[PDB]
């Protein structure tokens, strides 16, 4: 069914940092002829909401008093701005984002422009369920983590290797005495305590989530599409 | 109070992996004389439980009629059962485990033996809260894949270090020696489309709890401040 395939699609997107008027939000979005489905979190807590064409209607009617057009026309304006500043916010934008919540609630509202009329719309956000907390952010970051240590591992023997051919010139006559700073063989244990010691209260920083968004999305929508394809 | 304490101490500990007859899950727990706090996942979903001396010393009592210390002795009798059990799946238990789901709730049950007699208990866990899943889980598994970003693109500055003092050794030696020098951007794609579908699988939660709990320790230390 067309709800089935919003959530699909929205598996595989990447997640997009969004400034919004007090804070920010972590938002992923999916949206077709059919509708749309959204995920956004703050790194406390996840929202999800799924929405068909009727509700587009409705809502836009609800929203809107000084202009109308066919749902799709509707659903195809949404993309248009959630699409560019996703990639980006030094894209200037000129719709405004805001959200508040009421117990397990969080609604996003949205200030465009559209057939040079002020446009609204208010995306109604409920708790998302643990299954897609886990399929959208357990089960991939936790894949991702996995990936990330095996491209550790063979970063590591390819330094070994490295090591290999700096002691063969070494022990062929190269150099007989040593005359300058190089670098020390390569020891993977001094190298993840000195890491750890060092560099990693910096390098684990979440923040505002843009560490995340900005560095790890090629890895996030690799890692979900082989979930997706593994599933069936 | 006792259960902030408990808390604390839970989300310092590791994660471990648990065998049953029937599945598998994944398990962390944390238990001193005031009670314990777990938490459980099979990775769809995740479970939580506390329990204080009073439900202890309850629970106890009901599954063990003709047994009669205090609950500290039980916590204490529980801690060993199951921390040098989580600490190595290959370690000769004294206990058998098993695993029911009832509507959302999860029960692990032991049975085991002390002094001739025989030992039970039930860890009776509901749905852990968002909060629970964000700390435990969300936050730690996001900060270790920046963190581990960080380790690649350091390691991938050394290979170039190298490499640098390798073509000046080239003032010639045998080239079946010479390796590639090192680029990293067809590193990432040749890794991306040769080791990624392997590399990324999650299985039972294994490779996770094998590979990656040193570094998950780290992360969730961190973050408490």
Partial sequence: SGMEELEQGLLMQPWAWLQLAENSLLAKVFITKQGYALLVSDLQQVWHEQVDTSVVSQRAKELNKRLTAPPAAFLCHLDNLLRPLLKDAAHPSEATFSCD??????????????????????????????????????????????????????????????????????????????????????????????????????????????????????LYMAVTTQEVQVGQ
């Avoid at 063979?154 to 700096?166: C, F, N, S």
């Avoid at 150099?175 to 190298?191: M, W």
């Avoid at 010691?197 to 995340?212: H, M, Q, R, T, V």
């Fill in 101 to 218: 919540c009421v117990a397990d609630a969080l609604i996003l509202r949205v200030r465009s422009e559209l057939s040079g009329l002020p446009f609204y719309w208010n995306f109604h956000c409920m708790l998302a369920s643990p299954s897609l907390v886990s399929q959208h952010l357990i089960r991939p970051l936790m894949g991702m983590s996995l990936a990330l240590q095996c491209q550790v591992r063979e970063l590591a023997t390819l330094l070994h290797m490295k090591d290999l051919e700096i002691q063969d010139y070494q022990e062929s006559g190269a150099t007989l005495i040593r005359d300058r700073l190089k670098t020390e063989p390569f020891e993977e244990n001094s190298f993840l305590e000195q890491f750890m010691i060092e560099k990693l209260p910096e390098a684990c920083s979440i923040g505002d989530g843009k560490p995340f968004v900005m560095n790890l999305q090629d």
